[PDB]
């Protein structure tokens, strides 16, 4: 009837890719985060920001290429193309590291626009919105690492660059400087990721091994029409199996599939709380009862004090080349070496 | 009628509380001895010379540790790969000093887990099930035997084996990074994709079932009570969740077949952990990951740094600091 | 030297929430024994 | 007072969800104790 109704009926039309209202936020912003990454890893260097090479023009393969974080002198500037740093020039915008905030900002509005996509399709199909709530897990890892972690730090420079090996140094930068593995929020996150991979490997292998005979063929994939009301696997058998192997087992398909949602997602929320606590440098660095004892008793050694000496090697050896803006000129005689290494 | 037939009838009975089976004849004595020695060695066990340099590393709770730092320490560098049981130790005090209980726990563990795996086969035979849950459990058995058995073999000592603890795990992972460069190795890459993908398709399948549940309850009681156990009606509209994901990405990327869907949940992690556990295995024999250090040069020939050179300087920090007294010669051959 | 307020953190972090979850189970079984009408309802 | 509330309901917790919530508290007590004792 009205003008709003014609636009509402056009976006929600059955077509190849469902656009909806949320596609106006997703499809422009996701296309430019992805294309900003493919351009930045191919053409744009890191020679002026980090003093590296992170492009395909500079000989890096898929692994050692990245879209890199800007300089520490930029601080937390948004680095707009028209801004006071770039001033409209495209070429000087790329050399300062403007594509990285271009990827991260238009990417953050892609994950907004993709989670709104999951509320919109669920309302048209008419289902409960648990996909949009389980996808809030990965939103809490993007925001609290690519956005909330460099905000608490000195600049955008201490953020993960969007490249394969550039994530890998961020894994190593976070052990030596922060002792991230000791943090109980990672420990509750590893329990959800390795716990979530566990549940789909079991539920994958128990459904597929309690199937009913619905055909004479040896292939069991053929014997399932999608609109049938009979269940395709014996729940009573699978309960009787695991009650004797493992001792305790699900007797509820509604509780089972909810539990496959809770376990992976909670590991992304609990691990997201800790990385917000490392923006503020509130790290779980030391057990002081272990540290006061190892200072007074020069014979008491645990595995825990062995990890601190591994972190002095990370804090001293890479920090010269890690942070060229700070100009660490270490002598050879201050770098902690071991015996004969 | 015979005594053996009345014993085979009991040991293979599915009417027991827990199925014992013929693999339980060597699962249960193995894993209860790996357990009962682990609880004692984690709580009350004296320090252990791990580096073979007579610098004993404390690992138990009574010697001032906690859950995180306490760990069953691996055996000595002095022993190395030699089999060191209690009777070949001339006292228990000489046994506990040189890293005794690490070999008693690990060898009774790998026998009991390889028997827990065959026990999952056996009950599937006696219940009429198709058999292959135990093939999915091969993937953590591959990974448990990679860090406790295969990596001490190729490195020639159980002292390079994984410490049974929590802080000892991260001593294992970081030293393995400096000496082998696991992150650049494509088999750790193929299993990070296995568990990121595994936790994706777990929470992606578990949401689309819970989204499309059928009304069987009221708003006061729980959602889960609309499933009566052993019912024959399907508890969710699978056509509904197919039409949702058929619009969320596009139409042809959606499994309408629930059997092929529930197979892909078992394929992706298990193949990802088979491949990963043969990354530790091929890096047990010093076939390390990629090494792109000093790979990008200018026309003058000066080395231009990359991200691998920054990653190298993190590896050089752990390499020059791991086992800071055990080395005497310029190259860590072990 | 350990912090002496951590004993109060842990042993009340165990007992107070764990004794809470016991109570929701005991009154659950009491309502089921309450409706059932035999020998235990009173 | 006034009349009885028609919004009185009952709270349930089956034996299954007891063991989840017990094990949830003890494992969080195992995990976070070492940091609190410092």
């Amino acid at each position: 009837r009205g003008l709003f109704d014609l636009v509402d009926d056009w976006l929600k039309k059955d077509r190849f890719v469902f656009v909806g209202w949320s596609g106006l936020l997703l499809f422009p912003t996701a296309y430019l985060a992805a294309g900003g990454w493919m351009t930045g890893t191919t053409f744009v260097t890191s020679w002026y920001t980090h003093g590296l090479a992170s492009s395909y023009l500079e000989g890096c393969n898929f692994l050692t290429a990245a879209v890199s974080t800007p300089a520490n002198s930029v601080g937390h500037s948004l680095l707009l193309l028209w801004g006071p740093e770039a001033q409209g020039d495209f070429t000087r915008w790329c050399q300062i590291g403007g594509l990285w905030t271009f990827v991260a900002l238009h990417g953050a509005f892609g994950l907004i626009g993709f989670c709104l996509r999951q509320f919109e399709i669920a309302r048209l199909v008419g289902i409960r919105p648990y996909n949009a709530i389980a996808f809030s897990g990965p939103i809490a890892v993007f925001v609290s690492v690519f956005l909330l972690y460099p905000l608490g730090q000195a600049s955008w420079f201490f953020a993960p660059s969007f490249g394969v090996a550039a994530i890998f140094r961020f894994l190593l930068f976070l052990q030596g400087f922060h002792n991230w593995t000791l943090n109980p929020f990672h420990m509750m996150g590893v329990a959800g990721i390795l716990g979530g991979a566990l549940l789909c490997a079991i539920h994958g292998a128990t459904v597929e091994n309690t199937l009913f005979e619905d055909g004479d063929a040896a292939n069991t994939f053929r014997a399932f029409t999608p609109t049938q009301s009979e269940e395709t696997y014996s729940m009573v058998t699978a309960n009787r199996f695991w009650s004797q192997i493992f001792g305790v087992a699900f007797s509820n398909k509604r509780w089972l599939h909810f539990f496959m949602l809770f376990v992976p997602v909670t590991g992304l929320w609990t691990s997201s709380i800790g990385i917000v606590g490392l923006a503020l440098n509130l790290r779980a660095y030391d057990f002081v009862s272990q540290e006061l004892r190892a200072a007074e008793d020069p014979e008491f050694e645990t595995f825990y004090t062995k990890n601190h000496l591994l972190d002095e090697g990370i804090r001293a050896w890479m920090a010269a080349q890690d942070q060229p803006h700070e100009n660490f000129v270490f002598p050879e005689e201050v770098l902690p070496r071991g015996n004969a290494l | 009628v015979s005594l053996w037939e009345r014993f085979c009838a009991w040991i293979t009975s599915t009417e027991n509380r827990l199925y014992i089976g013929w693999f339980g004849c060597l699962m249960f004595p193995t894993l209860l001895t790996a357990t009962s020695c682990f609880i004692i060695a984690f709580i009350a066990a004296p320090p252990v010379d791990i580096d073979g340099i007579r610098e004993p590393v404390a690992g138990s709770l009574l010697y001032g540790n906690n859950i995180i730092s306490g760990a069953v320490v691996p055996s000595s560098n002095a022993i190395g790969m030699h089999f060191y049981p209690i009777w070949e130790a001339a006292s228990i005090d000489e046994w506990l000093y040189n890293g005794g209980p690490y070999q008693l726990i690990v060898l009774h563990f790998l026998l009991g887990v390889s028997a827990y795996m065959g026990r999952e086969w056996e009950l599937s035979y006696r219940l009429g099930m198709r058999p292959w849950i135990f093939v999915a459990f091969s993937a953590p058995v591959a990974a448990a035997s990679a860090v406790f058995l295969v990596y001490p073999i190729g490195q020639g000592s159980f002292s390079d084996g994984m410490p049974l603890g929590i802080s000892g795990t991260f001593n294992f992972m970081l030293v393995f990074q400096a000496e082998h460069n696991i992150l650049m190795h494509p088999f750790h890459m193929a299993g990070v994709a296995g568990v990121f993908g595994g936790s994706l398709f777990s929470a992606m399948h578990g949401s689309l079932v819970t989204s499309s549940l059928i009304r069987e309850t009221t708003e006061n009681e729980s959602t889960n009570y609309g499933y009566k156990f052993g019912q024959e009606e399907e508890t969710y509209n699978i056509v509904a969740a197919h039409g949702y994901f058929g619009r969320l990405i596009f139409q042809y990327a959606s499994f309408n077949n629930s059997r092929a869907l529930h197979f892909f949940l078992a394929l992706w992690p298990v193949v990802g952990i088979w491949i990963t556990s043969m990354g530790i295995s091929t890096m047990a024999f010093n076939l390390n990951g990629f090494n792109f250090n000093q790979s990008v040069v200018d026309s003058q020939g000066r080395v231009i740094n990359t991200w691998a050179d920054i990653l190298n300087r993190a590896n050089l920090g752990i390499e020059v600091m791991h086992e800071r007294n055990a080395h005497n010669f310029p190259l860590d051959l072990a | 030297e350990v912090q002496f307020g951590a004993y109060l953190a842990v042993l009340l972090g165990t007992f107070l929430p764990a004794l809470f979850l016991v109570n929701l189970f005991i009154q659950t079984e009491a309502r089921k024994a309450g409706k059932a009408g035999g020998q235990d309802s009173d | 007072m006034t009349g009885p509330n028609p919004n009185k309901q009952a709270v349930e917790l089956n034996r299954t969800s007891l063991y989840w919530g017990l094990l949830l508290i003890f494992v969080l007590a195992v995990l976070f104790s070492s940091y609190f004792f410092n």
Binding site: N239 | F229, G230 | - | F37
Partner: peptide, 30 residues
């Protein structure tokens, strides 16, 4: 004195594992 709490948390965790396996609410059809 400090390790006494850690031991009580560990064997207390193994108690509720014991009760969950053997005293489980046995599911029944009908």
């Amino acid at each position: 004195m400090e390790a006494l709490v850690y031991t009580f948390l560990l064997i207390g965790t193994l108690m509720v594992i014991f009760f969950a396996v053997f005293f489980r609410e046995t599911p029944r059809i009908l």
